[model samples]
Target: TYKAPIERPEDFLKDKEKAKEWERKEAERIEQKLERSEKEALESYKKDSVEISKYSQTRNYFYDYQIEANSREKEYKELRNAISKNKIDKPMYVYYFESPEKFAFNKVIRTENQNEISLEKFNEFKETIQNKLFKQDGFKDISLYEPGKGDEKPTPLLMHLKLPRNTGMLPYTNTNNVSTLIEQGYSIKIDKIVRIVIDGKHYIKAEASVVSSLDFKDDVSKGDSWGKANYNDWSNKLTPNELADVNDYMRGGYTAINNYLISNGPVNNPNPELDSKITNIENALKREPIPTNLTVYRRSGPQEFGLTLTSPEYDFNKLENIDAFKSKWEGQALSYPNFISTSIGSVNMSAFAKRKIVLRITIPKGSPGAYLSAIPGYAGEYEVLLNHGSKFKINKIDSYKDGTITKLIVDATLIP
Candidate 1:
């Protein structure tokens, strides 16, 4: 560690008033020393000497430390101001949400209680995010595994009890070639595993890339294994990439988890972003209003003898179909709409999301209503009055006919 030579009171910092910079003039004089011989050599023909190489390697320690220190200082300041101003505006860091995966399958598995969600489904969804979202997005912090790489890179020495080769395998290849490349200073390459929390549930997150072998040293020879990661000498010095990896994991990991749960997790349950509406009793009690059955006799002056209803008096198909399906209760206005505003009153028009109901009726040619299709006004679109007196939307109508019978299929919507 390079120590700063300046005195800091640990006071003169913040959180108080008369506590401003009153007691202050602090300076840290970091010590620096260089050997003249090494400097001279770098300038001479022997410039590529180990001294120059070592210095070049050591120089980066300072740069890396500077990045870490400055980043921390800025973070501290940004945090305080963000709080003091009570504004998250232009935050040093902000989060965003993109639509989450459509989760192709319905995630139908469930744990019977609140019927909230199936734990299996939820986990599958999380795994999907790991690969589909984070990994695909190339977030710097995503942890990815590399194949062709494992516990042994070049493999250290090992003394093993051997079993005859080619006997069709056993515990670990039956070929008992084993290693005690065993040591202390060696680590399992310290793959940082960050667990992200979603809706109070915990899960693993791949937040860092694996370290690849660097061709720096055969220096890590048999002696490097100090038995576990105990001795510094036996261990490869931890790289700055490793140290910074932790930072990336801790910083962005939570936000990634955050956006996922809120955006797509169960609505109102694990997530609080969904909108809520109050159900009014009065409103719920009313049924969607539908226009009166299109049946009425029109009167004309002189030469008009028989009463002929134009367009079949609104219900071109028949007054009876709707009359029978009519609700026992008066349907609400704006229930059904006044198409063309009740023929002109826009204010009288309204729409509702009515329920849907499917009905299929088949009649033989000799049946009663079977002859009905022969009527002049019996075709086109027709409203279906549902039982319990409600408008049930129908999706489609299909008509099929054989030599003995004719079929009529209809699709429509239950409207309010």
Candidate 2:
């Protein structure tokens, strides 16, 4: 005889707020657990402190001056190499110039107003200076600017100039030494600008600023830290994989810099390495795997031994004979009657029933395929096809003990 089970009135009562509060608490607890676990994992490789005293040394102006000169020389060599290699469509040149006064030490020499100068006038000035100094053809293109900018006016001085495109400008017949190289084609010119200052007594005083160019040399070997290092060599020594990972990690620092340079012009953020690291970490987190856990079920039948995957956007598919599946599933039994199946009969039954039975599997949140949208930018989906053998039935798929197995989750963004 069938009897109805009595239900308690209190048990049937609804507590919406309490249920909501319970769910919120459970989510918070899970988040905290994941955070703690991540922190513990990171602590293994975390450093306590890093020594950065070498960064504090004041830059040697003379050495830097020499390096800058040599760098220009290297740039010329590269330009010629490019020409020789036919890497560029148009002839390109590098023009170098410095104020006569030590712009590095003299604040007054640095305050010249360059904003009013038109591009055409600047080019004309470059040509005039080139003709006067080098007595040869000028560069097709030239870049001109003070090394640094500040509030105080700069000293009127032009220190050095190098025209890259004009091989005739190579100071020496040899084109080997810095000083000889400068003597060949580098030139300087002097000009003056007037600035007016208004005093509190309603009096205007005019001040003249000097702008003069001087001869500069590219002497890398002469300085304490010159020829021994080059830009590509220095950049190559950096952790290439880490940097590449960072670049990939960051949406695209190169693209960001390109856009920034195009829109706002050039602004120096010298440590591209640091930028790479920051952007890499940021992007890595965005594509990082979500926290996840595995739920294991004992296989009940030949049909039950397979994985049934379901998503709103796709039909349910059974992963049968998963033993042969190419993915990294582990924990297969060594014995003839593999733990995947208890007997040959079960294997045979599963093989015949492969098309008929459907299994409902509960995949935990954070499984690899679980959250489709959060997948790393570099991943793609792979379909698993089932092949059942006559001798053995796969009864169960073992869950990884390492806790790294990812369950597939449907992405909310994917429309069915």
Candidate 3:
């Protein structure tokens, strides 16, 4: 029975298709009304540990669009995240600055096919080039040490406070340079490294004792510093403007780092470098992380001495001195690792979006072996830190140690 008695069975018969469309619109309206109600009810009780608001708005037909409201909800969450945190306490990732050690600061090698470089000869040559490089002109460029194994003792810090408390460390050496030479030739591949970051803005190579994901495993306690160095773990925030505190640790870069440490006032806290001095942004509006190509490098110039190196005889066989002088000079910034804004998503964990960064360089080891590169080519250790800086998975860090050896065992996740 046609209760309204408005039309016959033939009413929309002529425009049957139009009727179908109207039917769809009507149903959509009903769905929208139902949803709005549902949301209100949910808002009322609010016992929620939830996932959506933009759960598809019944395709709101008010010419209503796909707010993906739930989607937008995620977007807003990300937006809030991006906003509340103006800057992360850690503003950089780890970048091993090994290049400058080899190809920089006047460490040039001219090959007129002049020298014989057998593994043995190469070894001695490495020692000369390595030990001779660190300090430059009048300034000490970069430095190295080897606070590994039995050397995990505490060395002293500047302890320059009012009472002048004594700060300490493990050991600092320079032999890692031998490996640096091989590293350049893919001989002793260094996947991990030791570095000093100054105010979250610069990286300087620490030659003595460096880190590998393995070191983290060997000394679970100590690796955090290693991992931390690589942006592998979280570095918590600190009270802003710890100026005096900054100088306290500035105890010994003795060169650019300690010198440049004082930037306008104590803008950032004394974040532990290698970890907290790193930051990344995951802009909601932009799909990629911010700054496009973020920068992380061992930035202090590894002050190098003019290398008295003769190019090894390549002998395209009989060629004498393949070429003349090639300039392998230490660069301005010590290292450059590609760092950029990142996302936190439901996928990853991000500390305060804009948490203040702390930059306290750790002296996991503390014996300043002989002040300066008058500093020996201690052990040839070089470090480069990677952000996310995985605990190596410890499982996530699985397969992380670069492909060096079980001498190598180590090396993210591809977002699903």
| TM-score winner | 3
Model 2 misplacement above 4 A:
1-184, 187-229, 239-242, 245-253, 260-416
lDDT of each: 0.21, 0.24, 0.21
Q: What is the lDDT of residue 218 in candidate 2?
A: 20
Number of the top lDDT candidate: 2
Q: Please give the lDDT score at residue 3 for candidate 3.
A: 38
Q: After superposition, how far is residue 236 of candidate 3 from its true place, in Å?
A: 20
Rank order (by lDDT, best first):
2, 1, 3
Model 1: per-residue Cα lDDT over 125-224, one tens digit each: 4443332111110011100111122222111111111111111110010123211100001001112223333333333322222112111111222212
Q: Considering summed lDDT, which 10 consecutive residues are worst modelled in model 3? A: 178-187
Worst 10 residues of 2 by lDDT: 407-416
Q: How far is 276's C-alpha from truth in model 2 (Å)?
A: 5.3
- lDDT score at residue 288, model 3, on the 0-100 scale: 15
Expressed as tens digits, the lDDT of each residue in 344-370 for candidate 2 is 010112232222221112212232211
Worst 10 residues of 1 by lDDT: 339-348
Against the true structure, candidate 1 reaches a TM-score of 0.12
Q: What is the C-alpha RMSD of each candidate to the true structure, in Å?
A: 36.6, 36.6, 29.5
